[PDB]
Amino acid sequence: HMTIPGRFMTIDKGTFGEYTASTRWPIIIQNAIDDLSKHQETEKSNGTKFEQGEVIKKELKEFRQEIIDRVPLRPFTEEEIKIANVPLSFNEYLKKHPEVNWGAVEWLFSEVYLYRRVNVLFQRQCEWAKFDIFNRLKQSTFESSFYGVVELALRYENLLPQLREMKQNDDILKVLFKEFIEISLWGNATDLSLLTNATLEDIKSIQGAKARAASESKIVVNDTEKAWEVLTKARADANSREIRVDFVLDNSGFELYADLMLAAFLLQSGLATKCIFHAKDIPYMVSDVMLKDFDILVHDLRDREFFPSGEPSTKESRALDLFAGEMEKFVSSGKIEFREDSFWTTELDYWNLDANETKYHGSILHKDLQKSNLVIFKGDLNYRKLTGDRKWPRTTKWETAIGPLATNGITSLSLRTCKADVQVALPEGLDAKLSQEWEKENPGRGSWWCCSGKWAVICFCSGI
Ligand SMILES: O=P(O)(O)OC[C@H]1O[C@](O)(CO)[C@@H](O)[C@@H]1O
Numbered sequence: 455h456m457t458i459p460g461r462f463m464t465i466d467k468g469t470f471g472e473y474t475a476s477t478r479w480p481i482i483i484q485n486a487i488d489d490l491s492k493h494q495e496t497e498k499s500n501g502t503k504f505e506q507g508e509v510i511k512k513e514l515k516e517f518r519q520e521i522i523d524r525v526p527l528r529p530f531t532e533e534e535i536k537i538a539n540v541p542l543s544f545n546e547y548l549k550k551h552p553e554v555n556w557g558a559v560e561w562l563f564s565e566v567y568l569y570r571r572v573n574v575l576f577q578r579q580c581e582w583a584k585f586d587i588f589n590r591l592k593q594s595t596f597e598s599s600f601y602g603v604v605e606l607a608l609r610y611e612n613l614l615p616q617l618r619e620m621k622q623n624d625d626i627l628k629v630l631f632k633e634f635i636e637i638s639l640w641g642n643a644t645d646l647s648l649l650t651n652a653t654l655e656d657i658k659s660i661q662g663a664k665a666r667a668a669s670e671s672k673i674v675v676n677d678t679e680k681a682w683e684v685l686t687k688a689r690a691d692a693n694s695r696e697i698r699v700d701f702v703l704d705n706s707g708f709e710l711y712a713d714l715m716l717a718a719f720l721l722q723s724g725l726a727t728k729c730i731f732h733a734k735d736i737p738y739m740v741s742d743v744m745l746k747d748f749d750i751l752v753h754d755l756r757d758r759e760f761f762p763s764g765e766p767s768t769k770e771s772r773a774l775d776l777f778a779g780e781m782e783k784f785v786s787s788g789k790i791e792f793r794e795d796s797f798w799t800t801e802l803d804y805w806n807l808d809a810n811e812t813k814y815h816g817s818i819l820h821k822d823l824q825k826s827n828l829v830i831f832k833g834d835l836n837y838r839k840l841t842g843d844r845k846w847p848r849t850t851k852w853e854t855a856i857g858p859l860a861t862n863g864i865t866s867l868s869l870r871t872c873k874a875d876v877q878v879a880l881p882e883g884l885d886a887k888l889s890q891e892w893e894k895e896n897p898g899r900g901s902w903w904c905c906s907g908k909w910a911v912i913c914f915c916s917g918i
């Protein structure tokens with residue numbers, strides 16, 4: 455369209471996307487090679503599995519060099535489409551963008567395509583078809599969040615009786631809503647000052663207020679209040695008892711844990727009656743949640759080698775066990791449901807979460823999501839897909855940036871730590887201010903303030 459900006463490109467000079475494509479992608483692929491080598495160390499050095507692994511390693515090496523060499527992105531072969539169940543969308547994109555190469559291609563398509571090429575290598579090898587080359591990293595990162603994991607578990611156990619009372623009914627509930635929304639937002643970047651308040655009394659205290667203010671000072675667009683209004687009004691409605699909340703997930707580990715905590719909080723307080731979680735169907739963007747990552751999380755909570763909370767009788771051990779158990783209970787009763795869909799791992803932006811997307815599940819998902827009271831989109835990549843990853847002016851109205859999602863009947867909330875060039879909905883002058891501030895310690899990269907992960911946005915749309 456004449457006034458819709460183009461998408462960020464791997465050749466947009468001076469952008470974080472350009473840096474990502476030229477510098478970060480080769481590192482991620484080399485890391486995968488190294489993690490495959492690491493896994494190899496734990497198995498026999500011959501046989502179909504070991505040999506298949508050596509071959510994947512060699513292909514990953516060549517793939518990394520392809521990115522460095524900036525070669526044209528090739529279509530998936532018919533064999534690859536069949537054996538690895540690749541969506542047909544990629545090849546249609548490539549037909550419409552002839553001879554695009556790593557050196558000059560849309561950042562969004564190419565990043566998604568990168569993980570697809572990696573996954574095809576695994577799916578071809580029978581002994582590796584379900585192996586997650588990012589699992590070692592996912593697990594190591596979550597392992598290192600022990601202190602925060604325990605603090606939140608302690609908090610859940612402490613709050614449980616009070617949440618029940620609240621469900622039986624509020625201004626204290628609003629404070630907790632902000633906390634759980636913000637912890638979900640920041641994920642493993644959450645400061646301990648927020649987490650160390652593990653009782654209602656500590657959360658309401660001066661200390662709690664200061665922690666929330668510190669967090670909120672970095673949330674430059676903050677529509678938390680709008681989501682609060684939606685759920686409280688739904689809870690107060692004399693008619694219709696079902697309150698459905700959806701999570702379009704981002705990272706595994708602590709972020710997924712914080713999302714589960716937010717869901718548990720909503721369920722126990724009456725702000726939700728059912729939460730549905732939407733995961734990726736292949737290893738993706740390194741850390742992104744797959745269905746199996748939820749099972750692994752629950753197992754981790756109970757694993758006293760992984761989370762060494764001490765003898766089973768510590769407050770710490772009991773709280774971890776309690777939460778794992780709660781997760782199993784919620785899944786069995788259907789209060790929490792996990793789903794995966796190939797749509798989330800295609801190149802399609804979320805302007806395709808619309809009835810007009812009739813080929814790759816977009817219309818199917820849109821129709822179902824219309825039924826949600828609140829669809830929460832987690833993290834940066836989801837925000838990129840909501841906005842088309844386009845070069846919008848940074849003051850662009852949120853409703854404009856999200857295209858048909860402004861008017862097609864989905865009520866949405868983006869919780870985005872800012873980690874990419876795309877940025878919209880800012881107040882006049884704010885970009886210049888933050889850019890000047892960030893320019894001090896990052897000469898020539900002031901505009902990268904919204905790529906640093908230090909700031910965040912919380913953006914709401916009614917879908918009407
Ligand atoms: O995990 P998130 O929040 O989706 O962030 C993904 C990060 O990786 C990127 O895809 C760049 O490689 C950006 O979206 C962001 O910097």
Ligand SMILES: [Mg+2]
Pocket residue numbers: 704705739741742833835
């Ligand atoms: Mg991610």
